[PDB]
């Protein structure tokens, strides 16, 4: 039952973001053709991002769709602070994913970002260097999402908590065997079973950190240490 057909008090409502409403008058005054000439074939126009983290120059950037992430990180963001190696970008926010260093050339686009697991989300790209540890980052955003759940459906209300304790056990080194398979199964079951988008995008960090940084988790749980040396319990 959609808001366009039944929204506020049962009457049709159109709920849109601020950015699309801001893009509308430009579309009207310059015509649709001018707007459609910017961006890829799937995504037209420009998108706003909030560069932060270990980037040299944070803030708001309005980039055409399809501009490579490497260009945004280096050319616009000014590179990594203190000229350290660039590990991953936490794109989308607490419900986004960690796009790794080798996928730095995936163009900015809904389809191209989503094909890497992450989501466009709140356009908040958190640039991170090789110092940062992936388990803590995944546990950091999952904690926020678990705190921000509303608690209606079982998969998001209690599944996110089980994932958070699993991640905490992994980071503390006190994790039992079978933690990686159980965590992955829990994440894919929460993602495919939750009702709203806060649960379907809740395990996006974990999943992404299990697609590109599985070795980080494996060294965390087996060797009882982290290569990034950021977990306080392991330093």
């Amino acid at each position: 039952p959609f808001p366009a057909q039944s929204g506020l008090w049962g009457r049709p409502t159109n709920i849109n973001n601020v950015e699309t409403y801001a893009n509308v008058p430009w579309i009207i005054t310059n015509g649709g053709k001018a707007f459609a000439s910017l961006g890829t074939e799937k995504s037209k126009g420009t998108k706003v991002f909030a560069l932060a983290g270990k980037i040299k120059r944070g803030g708001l950037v309005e980039v055409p769709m399809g501009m490579s992430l490497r260009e945004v990180i280096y050319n616009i963001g000014g590179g990594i602070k203190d000229d350290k190696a660039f590990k991953a970008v936490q794109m989308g926010g607490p419900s986004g994913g960690c796009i790794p260093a080798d996928l730095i050339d995936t163009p900015v686009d809904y389809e191209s970002i989503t094909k890497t697991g992450a989501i466009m989300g709140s356009g908040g790209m958190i640039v991170m260097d090789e110092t940062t540890c992936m388990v803590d980052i995944a546990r950091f955003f999952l904690e926020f999402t678990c705190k921000e759940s509303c608690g209606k459906c079982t998969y998001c209300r209690v599944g996110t908590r089980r994932m958070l304790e699993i991640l905490d056990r992994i980071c503390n080194g006190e994790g039992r065997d079978g933690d990686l398979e159980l965590l992955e199964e829990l994440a894919v079951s929460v993602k495919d079973g939750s009702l709203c988008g806060l649960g379907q995008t809740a395990p996006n960090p974990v999943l992404t950190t299990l697609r590109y940084f599985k070795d980080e988790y494996i060294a965390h749980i087996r060797d009882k240490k982290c290569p990034a040396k950021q977990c306080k319990a392991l330093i």
Partner: protein, 1178 residues
């Protein structure tokens, strides 16, 4: 409409459009799990159990929300769906803090419902407790006498004071059952299958018991002269008397089991014969070959096996003892042999065990008792030689041993000590070091290395096809309840095999609490355990009389009342437990932080437990959408969400009306309704449909009982499936122990018990004396309005027999509708509320009748318009278009004048159908029309169809007459969807009025005050308690006869008090507020054996009235037909019931619009007083 073609689980269905997948699967016998779905509420989507895989869609679709379309292929059991549901159930369990079955049940090898029958004992239901035992244990008394009771080692009351005497209680109820005729469970129809059981021991007899229940033909071949096994030829008489065993075996034989004794396998009968003439064979031969001493000289005369010696003793065969007896062993056999030898005249008996006291397999109590009797013990001593002189044993040489290292058991291994040897002088040596399966009996079978029969675990099947085994023959010597459990499991497996599909035993998964500690019970009251009566050692060491004696009934109830009720009360109706059993859920992997937020409450009806809440929201949605009170709500957000009442207040301090819908809709026992019994116990009840009698809405309900006690009440899913506080919770008076069951008559100025015949004779003679001395019309009959139609008609007949026209009720109000329309009845039915255009709810319609409030809420949601006329606030004012707060009937006169002024009355038709119109116009010609009256008249005139709902018990008759006038003027009477509906105060007010009880309280009181009425026959009313001013009026009666359920304050001043039974103990017919005739079924048999109709029929036969239920029903039907009221949904369709066949418009003077009156019905008044004392609403 269009028929959509769908395919669910490879089965083509032609469903209707606009239906959800859940409804289609329900109506086509396809099971889809659901926890947060109710038909009366909009979809929620929380639990995510109803996910089904739809072809063409990538995501699993919820069956509770998705609507079936054309060409839909739905798979409700695909592996993706199963994995999704299993993960959801595991996630729900990860936050669940409950106990599906108490530790006592889990510790019992037979898994007997220990909590169930303990709680049934605490309620006085001994036969139900025995029946519950016999569902898993065919020998309550025998096993209760002889059992190490591991259940008491796991009893949670160990954490407070002392474990519950479960074995003693079971022995007590078994003795009670055996004292009278025993209990035989129902037997299924004969299946024509023959099963051969070899052995008459606990395992074989248990298999026979649980296979004869399935309808098979059972024959038990027993080698010994009498069945019983080691329960007879083992355990001695002072521990298990053989009369009890004989009685239990006779009970088993009463089920159709043919026990052929003296038949031995391999000697008298052959295994091939059994395999040929029988479908299945179950071998329960047991371990009947005592182990030899294993030392040189063990074959010398004077050395006898333990079980052989005990069999000789039990059979009264001559055995050769002496002054000196040695016993080698440490089990039950050794201790029994030692104590038997002590009682058989041996001067000294010494038991030699190779281990120490702590590692004795025998119970500590048995060893201590034997020490009291005079048995000596030598530990860490093992035999090595038998010193025999002339072929007879003179002594035995033992080698002292010491605890050296660990062993297979893991505790401690005894090893011999070199140079340590002791000679023990003994005329007799009894080797009781254990028993082994007799190889001769088990010929032609594959044997385990231990010597026992080898069977497939979980199926109890031997190497030979169709031959099963169990008991001591398979597991070796164990306790008797293990053999009984093996027999029961083998019986179930054998029944499955006979049906064709052999299925191994599957153990269910239970949710259990393992974090419990004694600090959780620091607040529980400490109660001493039941004392054990044990015979004196000196007097008992000489005879074979039983040592311990059975508890008394008082002690049994006091012991069973010590139970902590550890198991979940919702076990037999929990759906989460069913679903986690249906799926291979592994909860340990996802186990983590779990809330502990349950705090005890003082609400007498509803108990809420946050630890078992799956947050489906059903309670909130049903309190907000159906009931309309909105007393519950979500609190916090996320993992910390909790369902709480208004501001987290106790349920009594909120606006909750104690309807119990939240308890009835909860799936997982978090919200429950407390049972109306002495001790709470989770039992499998039986539900019977009956009709509530506490007001005229006539809500049907399912009363769930177990024995002669009512255990719960559930609403019927007819319309909104709702019950108010009365119907749901005031059924507690049925179990009330203050009910009188025998009549009382005045002897020496005090009421004392008598027989029914004498009491009814006294009643008849007193009434006849009053009639003779004071003439006709001198006896008043004040009958309650909760009686059936037949009882009211019989009371009218009796009043005619007594020549008295004073037939009335104190609950009856002055009638106005029969002087206007002709009949005092509701014109229309409850089914036209939904389809009417305007509803005028007058009085406390929603407050007094919560079900009617829900009906009005649903009708307004469907499109109706509600106008509430009252004096104070009403719950219906939220959705009312117009609300009027009035205190006088001048409002209705002004409304009539406003209707006349705006020409909203068609004077031609009204004058055609209603006499008395010009005088009504003259009466309303002078009143002043107010703004509210004008608005009300505009609303009424603009409505095509109108229904006036009047709370008869809170609205004065002047208001009813004025509303009837208003309906008649606007022509809203005698047509479909238009009319007036009176919600009567009691269950059968309409039926009582139709039968002839039509005298109000005021008339009867006036007649008494004048002195015209000198005697009263009050049937289930409480004039003294309800009204204080009536206390003087009742002082004017020469004779008072009371027929009441309880000894009320008005029954204590009577001359004869006759007991009545509840409405669940009396069958008959009642009449709803709209005139619908409903049936009162018999949920329970009458407690005193006499129904209300039976008592009144006896009293009437004393007057020469020959009647019964069928004759009275026929007369009632004829009476209803003569008034054109029988099975008529709308009244006055053809013409009104006045003799003129016209409406006599109500013309009168102004008066208060609403009145407040008491309740004179005994049970309703008592429950209202209870609710007021507890500060509850309704």
């Amino acid at each position: 409409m269009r028929l959509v073609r769908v395919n669910i689980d490879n089965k083509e269905i032609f469903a209707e459009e606009g239906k959800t997948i859940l409804e289609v699967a329900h109506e086509n016998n396809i099971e889809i799990p659901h926890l947060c779905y109710d038909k009366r509420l909009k979809p929620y989507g929380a639990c995510g159990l109803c996910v089904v895989e739809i072809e063409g869609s990538p995501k699993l679709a919820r069956a509770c929300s998705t609507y079936v379309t054309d060409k839909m292929v739905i798979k409700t059991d695909s592996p993706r769906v199963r994995n999704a549901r299993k993960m959801a159930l595991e996630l729900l369990l990860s936050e669940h803090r409950g106990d599906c079955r108490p530790p006592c049940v889990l510790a019992c090898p037979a898994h007997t419902d220990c909590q169930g029958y303990v709680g049934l004992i605490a309620n006085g239901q001994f036969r139900e407790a025995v029946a519950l035992i016999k569902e898993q244990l065919p020998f309550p008394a025998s096993i209760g006498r002889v059992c190490p009771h591991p259940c008491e080692e796991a009893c949670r009351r160990n954490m407070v004071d002392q474990p519950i005497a479960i074995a003693e209680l079971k022995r007590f109820v078994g003795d009670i059952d055996l004292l009278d005729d025993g209990y035989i469970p129902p037997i299924k129809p004969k299946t024509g299958k023959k099963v051969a059981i070899v052995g008459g021991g606990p395992a074989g007899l248990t298999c026979a018991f649980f296979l004869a229940k399935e309808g098979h033909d059972i024959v038990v071949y027993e080698a010994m002269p009498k069945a019983g096994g080691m329960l007879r030829y083992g355990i001695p008489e002072y521990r298990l008397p053989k009369g009890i065993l004989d009685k239990e075996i006779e009970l088993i034989e009463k089920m159709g089991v043919q026990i052929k004794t003296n038949m031995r396998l391999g000697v008298d009968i052959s295994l091939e014969y059994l395999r040929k003439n029988y479908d299945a064979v179950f071998l329960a031969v047991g371990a009947w070959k005592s182990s030899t001493l294993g030392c040189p000289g063990d074959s010398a005369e004077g050395v006898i096996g333990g079980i052989e010696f005990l069999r000789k003793v039990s059979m009264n065969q001559p055995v050769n003892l002496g002054q000196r007896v040695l016993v080698v062993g440490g089990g039950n056999t050794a201790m029994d042999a030692a104590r038997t030898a002590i009682r058989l005249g041996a001067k000294e008996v010494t038991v030699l065990y190779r281990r120490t006291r702590e590692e004795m397999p025998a119970e500590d109590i048995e060893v201590n008792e034997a020490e009291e009797e005079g048995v000596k013990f030598q530990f860490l001593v093992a035999p090595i030689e038998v010193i025999t002189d002339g072929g007879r044993v003179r002594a035995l040489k033992c080698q002292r041993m010491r605890l050296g290292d660990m062993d297979e058991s893991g505790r401690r291994r005894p090893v011999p000590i070199e140079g340590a040897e002791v000679i023990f002088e003994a005329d007799t040596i009894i080797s009781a070091i254990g028993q082994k399966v007799r190889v001769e009996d088990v010929e032609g079978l594959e044997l385990t290395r231990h010597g026992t029969i080898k069977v497939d675990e979980g199926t109890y099947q031997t190497s030979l096809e169709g031959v099963f085994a169990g008991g001591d023959a398979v597991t070796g010597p164990k306790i008797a309840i293990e053999a009984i459990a093996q027999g029961k499991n083998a019986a179930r497996v054998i029944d499955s095999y006979l049906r064709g599909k052999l299925e191994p035993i599957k153990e269910p998964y239970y949710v259990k609490q393992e974090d419990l500690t004694p600090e959780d019970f620091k607040d529980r009251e400490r109660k001493p355990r039941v004392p054990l009566k044990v015979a004196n050692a000196e007097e008992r060491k000489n005879n074979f009389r039983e040592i311990t004696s059975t508890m008394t009934e008082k002690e049994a109830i006091a012991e069973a009342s010590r139970c902590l009720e550890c198991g979940c009360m919702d076990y037999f109706e929990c759906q989460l437990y069913k679903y986690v059993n249906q799926y291979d859920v592994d909860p340990q992997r996802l186990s983590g932080y779990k809330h502990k937020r349950y705090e005890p409450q003082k609400h007498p009806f509803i108990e809420r437990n946050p630890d078992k809440c799956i947050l489906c929201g059903l309670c909130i949605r049903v309190c907000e959408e159906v009931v309309g009170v909105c007393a519950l709500g979500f609190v916090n957000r996320g993992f910390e969400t909790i369902v709480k009442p208004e501001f987290g207040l106790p349920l009594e301090e909120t606006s909750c009306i104690s309807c119990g819908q939240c308890a009835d809709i909860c799936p997982t026992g978090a919200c429950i309704g407390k049972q109306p019994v002495a001790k709470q116990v989770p039992v499998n009840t039986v539900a019977t449909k009956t009709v509530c009698t506490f007001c005229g809405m006539g809500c049907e309900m399912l009363v769930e009982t177990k024995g002669n006690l009512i255990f719960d009440v559930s609403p019927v899913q007819s319309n909104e499936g709702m019950l108010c506080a009365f119907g749901r919770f005031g059924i507690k008076y049925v179990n009330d122990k203050d009910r009188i069951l025998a009549p009382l008559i005045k002897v020496n100025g005090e009421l004392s018990k008598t027989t029914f015949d004498q009491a009814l004779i006294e009643t008849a003679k007193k009434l006849q004396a009053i009639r003779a001395s004071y003439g006709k019309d001198s006896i008043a009959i004040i009958a309650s309005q909760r009686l059936t139609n037949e009882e009211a008609l019989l009371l009218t007949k009796l009043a005619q027999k007594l020549d008295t026209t004073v037939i009335g009720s104190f609950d009856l109000r002055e009638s106005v509708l029969d002087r206007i329309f002709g009949l005092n009845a509701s014109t229309n039915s409850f089914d036209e509320i939904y389809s009417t255009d305007l509803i005028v709810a007058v009085g406390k319609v929603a407050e007094n009748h919560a079900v009617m409030g829900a009906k009005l809420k649903k009708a307004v949601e469907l499109g109706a318009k509600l106008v509430t006329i009252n004096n104070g606030e009403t719950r219906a004012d939220e959705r009312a278009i117009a609300t009027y707060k009035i205190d006088n009937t001048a409002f209705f006169k002004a409304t009539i004048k406003a209707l006349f002024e705006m020409k909203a009355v068609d004077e031609d038709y009204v004058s055609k159908i209603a006499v008395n119109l010009d005088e009504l116009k003259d009466d309303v010609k002078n009143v002043e029309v107010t703004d509210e009256a004008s608005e009300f008249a505009k609303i009424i005139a603009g409505a095509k169809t109108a229904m006036v709902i009047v709370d008869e018990e809170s609205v004065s008759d002047t208001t009813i007459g004025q509303l009837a006038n208003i309906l008649t003027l606007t022509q809203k009477i005698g047509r479909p969807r238009c009319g007036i509906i009176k919600v009567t105060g009691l269950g059968n007010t309409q039926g009582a009025w139709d039968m002839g009880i039509r005298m109000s309280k005021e008339g009867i009181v006036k007649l008494i005050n004048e002195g015209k009425v000198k005697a009263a026959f009050i049937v289930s009313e409480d004039p003294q308690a309800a009204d204080k001013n009536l206390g003087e009026v009742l002082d004017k009666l020469e004779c008072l006869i009371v027929a009441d359920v309880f000894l009320t304050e008005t029954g204590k001043r009577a001359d004869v008090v006759l007991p009545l039974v509840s409405h669940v103990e009396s069958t008959g017919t009642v009449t709803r507020a709209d005139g619908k005739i409903q049936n009162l079924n018999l949920v329970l048999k009458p407690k005193n054996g006499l129904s209300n109709l039976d008592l009144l029929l006896k009293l009437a036969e004393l007057f020469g009235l020959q009647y019964n239920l069928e004759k009275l029903n026929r007369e009632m039907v004829e009476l209803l037909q003569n008034e054109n009221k029988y099975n008529q949904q709308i009244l006055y369709t053809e013409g009104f019931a006045t003799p003129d066949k016209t409406v006599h418009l109500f013309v009168s003077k102004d008066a208060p619009a609403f009145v407040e009156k008491a309740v004179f019905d005994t049970v309703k008044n008592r429950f209202e007083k209870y609710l007021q004392d507890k500060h509850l609403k309704y």
